[PDB]
Design goal:
The complex is a heterodimer of chains A (about 130) and B (about 180).
Chain A lengths: L2 E9 L12 E8 L7 E4 L8 E5 L6 E9 L4 E2 L2 E2 L15 E10 L9 E11 L1
Chain B lengths: L1 E7 L3 E5 L5 E7 L5 E8 L2 E3 L2 E4 L4 E7 L7 E10 L3 E17 L15 E4 L2 E5 L7 E6 L2 E2 L9 E5 L7 E6 L10 E4 L1
Parallel strand pairs in B: 2-9
Antiparallel strand pairs in B: 1-3, 3-7, 4-6, 4-8, 5-7, 8-9, 10-11, 11-14, 12-13, 12-15, 15-16
Classes of the chains: A mainly beta (about 130), B mainly beta (about 180).
Chain lengths: ~130, ~180
């Protein structure tokens, strides 16, 4: 048996400026695996529990997001930079699991229009 | 939408202690090229980084401890691809690298049934020299987020109404599910 892992990212609605909280930034489907703690989403910011998006205009405007999902209807989450935001460890749904990337907020506020990015590694420990 | 995928040709490697090496194929199943970045965690992996083109497969060499027990490492294989929001992902596919002495005489499934259970947490006891990589586990008919049980050791699980039946399947050397065992506690 091969160990195949896939990810699909479906973009969410446009975000308009503070930005609103709990906004669906986009949806991730992880597939191919044979628990939530076996999956870890990491980024350069390395903020525990959140993925951080940074502006490309050199002003270092940031906002954070969480990654969360539902089990067979408790809130669950993979590790994000090494820690879980909500829920106990749970077995992932058979075949594939959806996770929702959802907005939190800006610690600094004062965002500006433009492009914000993040580069995210998804580690799966089969 | 954006797609990502990395496939490793096996879901575990059983590495005979002191053997010269093993080969593992890696596939870039996507339509763009990636750099493949391979690592061992707690051995060399050649090449540690190389370009793998769209739809292509290549091979990695894995090359070399306690002599009574298995040891465990992880091989991780990462594919790095080339208010508006733009996120890029990379998959880092990790599998068990189980270093197994020749002296050990058998495999995990021969000792799968020997797991004994206690509550003190639900504590599994493993008297075998192998890792018991459990793929499915229940107690009181309730699901328990699973984990491996280390050789000659124990592991403790958080409890999920008075029922005492534990059932488990280990994952075998071919990455298949092994037989269901069941015991009263």
């Amino acid at each position: 048996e091969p160990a195949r892992i896939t990810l699909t990212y479906k973009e969410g609605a446009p975000i308009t400026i503070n930005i609103d909280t709990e906004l669906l930034v986009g949806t991730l489907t992880l597939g191919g695996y044979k628990t939530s703690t076996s999956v870890n989403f990491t980024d350069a910011a390395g903020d525990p529990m959140y993925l951080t998006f940074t502006s490309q205009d050199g002003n270092n405007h940031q906002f954070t997001t969480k990654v969360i999902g539902k089990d067979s209807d408790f809130d669950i989450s993979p590790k994000v930079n090494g820690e879980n935001l909500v829920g106990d460890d749970v077995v992932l749904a058979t075949g594939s699991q959806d996770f929702f990337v959802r907005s939190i907020g800006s610690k600094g506020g004062k965002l500006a229009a433009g492009k914000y990015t993040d580069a995210v590694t998804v580690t799966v420990s089969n | 939408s954006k797609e990502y995928g990395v496939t490793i040709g096996e879901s575990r490697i059983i590495y005979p202690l002191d053997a010269a090496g093993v080969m593992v194929s890696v596939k870039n199943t996507q339509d763009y090229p990636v750099l493949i970045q391979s690592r061992i965690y707690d051995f060399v992996v050649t090449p540690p980084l190389f370009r793998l083109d769209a739809k292509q497969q290549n091979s990695l060499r894995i090359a070399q401890f306690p002599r009574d027990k298995e040891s465990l490492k992880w091989l991780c294989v990462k594919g790095i691809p080339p208010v508006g929001v733009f996120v890029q992902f990379a998959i880092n596919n990790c599998i068990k690298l189980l270093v197994r002495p020749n002296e050990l005489k058998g495999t995990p499934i021969q000792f799968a049934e020997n797991l004994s259970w206690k509550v003190d947490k639900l504590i599994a006891e493993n008297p075998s020299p192998f890792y018991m990589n459990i793929g499915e586990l229940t107690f009181g008919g309730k699901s328990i987020p699973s984990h491996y049980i280390p050789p000659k050791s124990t592991w403790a699980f958080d409890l999920p109404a008075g029922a005492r039946n534990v059932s488990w399947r280990i994952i075998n050397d071919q990455g298949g599910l092994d037989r269901l065992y069941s015991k009263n506690v």
